[PDB]
Amino acid sequence: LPALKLALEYIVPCMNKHGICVVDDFLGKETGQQIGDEVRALHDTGKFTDGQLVSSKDIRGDKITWIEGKEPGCETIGLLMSSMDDLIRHCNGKLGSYKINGRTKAMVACYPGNGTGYVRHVDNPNGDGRCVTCIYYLNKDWDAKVSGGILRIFPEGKAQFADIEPKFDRLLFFWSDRRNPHEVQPAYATRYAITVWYFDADERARAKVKY
Numbered sequence: 392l393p394a395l396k397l398a399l400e401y402i403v404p405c406m407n408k409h410g411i412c413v414v415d416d417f418l419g420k421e422t423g424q425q426i427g428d429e430v431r432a433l434h435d436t437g438k439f440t441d442g443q444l445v446s447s448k449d450i451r452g453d454k455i456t457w458i459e460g461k462e463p464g465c466e467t468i469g470l471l472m473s474s475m476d477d478l479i480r481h482c483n484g485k486l487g488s489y490k491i492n493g494r495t496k497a498m499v500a501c502y503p504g505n506g507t508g509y510v511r512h513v514d515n516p517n518g519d520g521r522c523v524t525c526i527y528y529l530n531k532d533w534d535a536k537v538s539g540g541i542l543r544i545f546p547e548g549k550a551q552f553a554d555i556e557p558k559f560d561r562l563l564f565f566w567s568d569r570r571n572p573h574e575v576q577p578a579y580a581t582r583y584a585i586t587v588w589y590f591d592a593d594e595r596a597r598a599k600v601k602y
């Protein structure tokens with residue numbers, strides 16, 4: 392579905408209402424599978440880290456690697472990034488009062504599927520400039536009931552919580568600040584995700600006064 396259409400008709404209305412927005416079958420099967428393969432290639436080649444230390448012979452969790460998008464063998468990933476930027480672009484000045492002028496590189500995360508997950512947290516608690524978190528999942532035929540790895544977010548100050556499964560070709564958007572505390576439940580199977588954070592012009596500008 393047309394980026395502009397999707398953005399104007401779904402992402403914007405949805406984001407400003409729930410602060411969270413899930414979009415299924417974003418790029419498509421062939422493309423999704425393509426991204427999946429490149430990601431896996433990076434894993435095989437050994438571009439990921441050993442994983443966040445969880446503990447002699449300790450247990451490591453999520454492994455990461457930063458992808459600019461033009462690295463050899465990451466064309467489709469670079470394509471997802473550009474496609475993500477396109478969506479945001481159409482949401483120009485539509486998401487909150489924010490004015491997105493930039494983003495970080497892509498963070499590819501891999502929970503090895505050895506029980507590790509990720510503690511409840513807030514992506515941007517100190518106002519480093521990130522206003523929107525964007526995550527793309529590439530796990531074909533994922534079954535949380537079997538492999539776990541659910542992403543649990545606690546939107547706003549509302550009771551209860553929303554559960555988002557790292558479904559294949561799924562794209563997710565959510566406020567990065569205190570409004571969206573979240574955690575990644577233990578994953579008993581390889582779980583890949585690609586994350587990109589979008590910067591708000593003003594918040595980022597005044598944050599620069601730190602380096």
Ligand SMILES: O=C(O)CNC(=O)c1ncc2c(I)cccc2c1O
Nearest residue numbers: 453455500509526542557573575584
């Ligand atoms: O994978 C998901 O669905 C959700 N991930 C996260 O919230 C998440 N948030 C922050 C993270 C950092 I600073 C570093 C690695 C992984 C990571 C994460 O994976």
Ligand SMILES: [Fe+2]
Nearest residue numbers: 512513514573
């Ligand atoms: Fe996070």
